[PDB]
Amino acid sequence: PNLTIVVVSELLHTNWTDYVCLLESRFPDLQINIVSAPQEDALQMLLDGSAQLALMFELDNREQFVELKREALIPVISKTHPLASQEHVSYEQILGTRQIVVASTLKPELLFSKHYWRTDNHHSACLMILRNLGWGVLPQEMFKENPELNNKLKALDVFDFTPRFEYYVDLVWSRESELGAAARFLIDYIRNKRM
Amino acid sequence: LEPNLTIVVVSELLHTNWTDYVCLLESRFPDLQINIVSAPQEDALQMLLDGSAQLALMFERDNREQFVELKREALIPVISKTHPLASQVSYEQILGTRQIVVASRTLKPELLFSKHYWRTDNHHSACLMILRNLGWGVLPQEMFKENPELNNKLKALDVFDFTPRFEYYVDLVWSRESELGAAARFLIDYIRNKRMQ
Numbered sequence: 529p530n531l532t533i534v535v536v537s538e539l540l541h542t543n544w545t546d547y548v549c550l551l552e553s554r555f556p557d558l559q560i561n562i563v564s565a566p567q568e569d570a571l572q573m574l575l576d577g578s579a580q581l582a583l584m585f586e587l588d589n590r591e592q593f594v595e596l597k598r599e600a601l602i603p604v605i606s607k608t609h610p611l612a613s614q615e616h617v618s619y620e621q622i623l624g625t626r627q628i629v630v631a632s633t634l635k636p637e638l639l640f641s642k643h644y645w646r647t648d649n650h651h652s653a654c655l656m657i658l659r660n661l662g663w664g665v666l667p668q669e670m671f672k673e674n675p676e677l678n679n680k681l682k683a684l685d686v687f688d689f690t691p692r693f694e695y696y697v698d699l700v701w702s703r704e705s706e707l708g709a710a711a712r713f714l715i716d717y718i719r720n721k722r723m
Numbered sequence: 724l725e726p727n728l729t730i731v732v733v734s735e736l737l738h739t740n741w742t743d744y745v746c747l748l749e750s751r752f753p754d755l756q757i758n759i760v761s762a763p764q765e766d767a768l769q770m771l772l773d774g775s776a777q778l779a780l781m782f783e784r785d786n787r788e789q790f791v792e793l794k795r796e797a798l799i800p801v802i803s804k805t806h807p808l809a810s811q812v813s814y815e816q817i818l819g820t821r822q823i824v825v826a827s828r829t830l831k832p833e834l835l836f837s838k839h840y841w842r843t844d845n846h847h848s849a850c851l852m853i854l855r856n857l858g859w860g861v862l863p864q865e866m867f868k869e870n871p872e873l874n875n876k877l878k879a880l881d882v883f884d885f886t887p888r889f890e891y892y893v894d895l896v897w898s899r900e901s902e903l904g905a906a907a908r909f910l911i912d913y914i915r916n917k918r919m920q
Contacts, residue, residue: 549855562844675872676870
């Protein structure tokens with residue numbers, strides 16, 4: 529017996545292992561395979577059956593979902609970047625600084641710099657921010673997992689002209705797929721908690 | 724209009740050191756958009772062939788690809804310091820302990836060292852589950868450089884009669900039938916010129 533969960537790339541460096549530990553303790557024989565993919569590929573994996581569950585942020589008639597949690601993100605820059613020497617920054621300065629963007633396409637309202645690089649996960653983005661290649665938005669969870677990031681990265685104070693950066697994480701599945709007892713248990717467990 | 728360079732790093736190589744090549748390209752081509760994506764081995768190759776990527780970071784390894792070897796990346800079998808096994812271990816116990824296997828999304832016996840295993844497609848996911856005491860696994864030494872916290876939580880396995888060598892040989896791969904931009908050609912010449920020694 530086995531269970532494949534696809535975590536969308538942008539949610540990899542958030543906090544999802546509690547659900548795996550829950551499943552392992554209740555189903556100690558279960559092989560649990562954790563894969564990652566972009567949103568669009570993860571959806572197709574649910575529909576063609578290669579994954580039973582998906583962790584997604586912001587679907588059609590054929591999926592169901594239950595809400596999991598909010599994940600906060602933080603705009604950051606390297607402490608040794610020239611822009612980091614200032615208490616405050618203007619929009620004009622952000623406009624002229626390279627943004628490291630995590631996606632894939634690109635929603636223009638989450639783009640604030642004229643020039644930008646695209647990467648598909650936050651680890652790659654964090655590495656390039658640490659090399660002073662630009663600024664970007666990283667999950668707060670990464671500073672829990674790696675406290676030394678606080679010594680290297682500083683929060684950009686950018687909030688007066690940017691939206692609150694956050695993910696609303698849902699547990700998603702295909703209505704017309706066959707869910708094993710393990711997947712069903714997890715869905716019942718969460719629903720039962722939410723009330 | 725607006726020059727682009729897309730590099731696909733295969734999943735297994737995501738938590739190795741590939742960032743020096745990006746800084747080299749950026750300092751030489753300051754107006755170049757450099758997109759770093761990740762994919763399984765099989766999909767990364769198709770990205771080269773259909774043009775979605777100009778360059779690929781692949782390991783171990785078709786007559787349509789050309790490549791130049793970059794470096795060896797060392798990997799370490801590790802377990803959480805609070806795992807029940809860590810308070811003492813034999814090879815028999817490793818056989819009976821769950822292995823968290825990292826492999827692009829099938830598994831040859833050469834990648835499997837325990838009777839039972841879970842499969843994940845990148846080392847961050849594997850590391851998270853090793854940290855939760857869900858098993859042991861093989862992680863790049865690079866992860867401990869990038870995250871010193873991991874040394875507080877994980878220990879290298881020391882097991883009698885268990886001495887395999889884990890390593891990747893990383894290659895820079897491209898399609899011989901695609902046309903490489905100037906940035907990709909610069910990197911290839913830079914690497915080949917270094918290997919002259």
